[PDB]
């Protein structure tokens, strides 16, 4: 159990019961396959599109473990993309919805100031 997963399960929001539809079950299976195959980075625009229309990855009102698993690899990637940008306003536009989600998730999991993404 990673530090973020351990932190997530310390919050009661992790205890909110949810009975997945077969659609949501597939969404969770899809991000598991993307994660374990090591392809989160090529699938960032797909993550951004999902999050345009959904508050969380598996079409839920509350963060689930899929959100924590994906945020764990996505935060470092997006932070690096932003730190290295020569036009951070455009980068922000390109990844606008992932950044909304990151902001929520890094506050929920109380990510340290060195590891978090300094936001605007």
């Amino acid at each position: 159990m990673s530090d973020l997963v351990t932190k997530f399960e310390s919050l009661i929001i992790s205890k909110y019961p949810v009975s997945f539809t077969k659609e949501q079950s597939a969404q969770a299976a899809q991000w598991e396959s993307v994660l374990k195959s090591g392809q989160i980075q090529p699938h960032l625009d797909q993550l951004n599109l999902v999050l345009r229309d959904n508050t969380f990855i598996v079409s839920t009102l509350y963060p689930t473990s899929t959100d924590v698993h994906v945020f764990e690899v996505a935060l470092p990637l997006i932070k690096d993309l932003v730190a290295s940008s020569k036009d951070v306003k455009s980068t922000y536009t390109t990844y606008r919805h992932i950044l909304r989600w990151i902001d929520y998730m890094q506050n929920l999991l109380e990510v340290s100031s060195t590891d978090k993404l300094e936001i605007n």
Partner: protein, 160 residues
């Protein structure tokens, strides 16, 4: 704000019907409540309000197969976790590193695949698929007579 609204403009409705409709549409815009203030669409001549969110879709093949089988079982397996993390990662190389493929596929049909029993689970099928794509000669020698469903799939998939 994932909503498009449009005016009745064309439509062969009478002029008075267009007016009634378009006054109603204009009033929806004016009395809209900020959080539901729709965007206007000008290359639709027909009046409607519609949600522009993406429909349900999946882009991952494993998820597609599991969805169409309603089979979400075994994702915690070592079988499946090896499929995903040891085999499926190799498929994203521009050119396949053949010596590694050889042992990892060997291992796959040593530990995890023996069978093509059935009823074949989505987990079984996803493992077979990944091994076939990487090392189908190992498969040919492993199972020279394939379940006919798998056989029909392979026959279709093998031609570009």
């Amino acid at each position: 704000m994932s909503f498009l609204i449009s005016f009745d403009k064309s439509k062969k409705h009478p002029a008075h019907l267009q007016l009634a409709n378009n006054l109603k549409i204009a009033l929806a815009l004016e009395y809209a409540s900020k959080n539901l203030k729709p965007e206007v669409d000008n290359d639709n001549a027909a009046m409607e309000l519609r949600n522009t969110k993406e429909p349900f879709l999946l882009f991952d093949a494993n998820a597609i197969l599991r969805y169409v089988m309603d089979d979400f079982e075994g994702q915690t397996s070592d079988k499946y976790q090896f499929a995903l993390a040891s085999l499926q990662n190799l498929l994203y190389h521009k050119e396949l590193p053949q010596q590694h493929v050889e042992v990892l596929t060997n291992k796959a049909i040593e530990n995890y695949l023996v069978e093509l029993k059935e009823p074949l689970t989505t987990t079984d099928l996803i493992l077979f698929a990944n091994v076939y794509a990487l090392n189908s000669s190992l498969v040919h020698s492993k199972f020279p007579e394939l379940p006919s469903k798998v056989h029909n799939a392979v026959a279709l998939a093998k031609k570009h």
